[PDB]
Amino acid sequence: GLSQGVEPDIGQTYFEESR
C-alpha cells in the first residue's frame, strides 16, 4: 500500500482508508 492504514502491503507500508 502507499499509506498508513491498518492492512500492510509488504514492508512497513499500508493501504488507505478509502470507501
User: Max alpha carbon distance in the chain (Å)?
Assistant: 24
CA dihedral 18, 6, 10, 3 (to 10 degrees): 50
C-alpha 2/C-alpha 11 separation (Å) is 11
Instruction: Look up residue 7 and give its amino acid.
Output: E
Contact 2, 13 (CB under 8 A): yes
Paired with 3 in beta bridges are 14
What value, to the nearest 5°, has the Cα angle with vertex 19 and ends 15 and 12?
10
Match 499500508 to its residue by C-alpha cell: 14
**CA-based radius of gyration for the chain:** 7
The experimental technique used to determine this model is: NMR
What b/e string do you get for 1-18 counting C-beta neighbours within 10 Å, with b at 16 or more? eeeeeeeeeeeeeeeeee
Contact 7, 15 (CB under 8 A): yes
Instruction: Look up residue 11 and give its amino acid.
Output: G
C-alpha 5/C-alpha 11 separation (Å) is 13
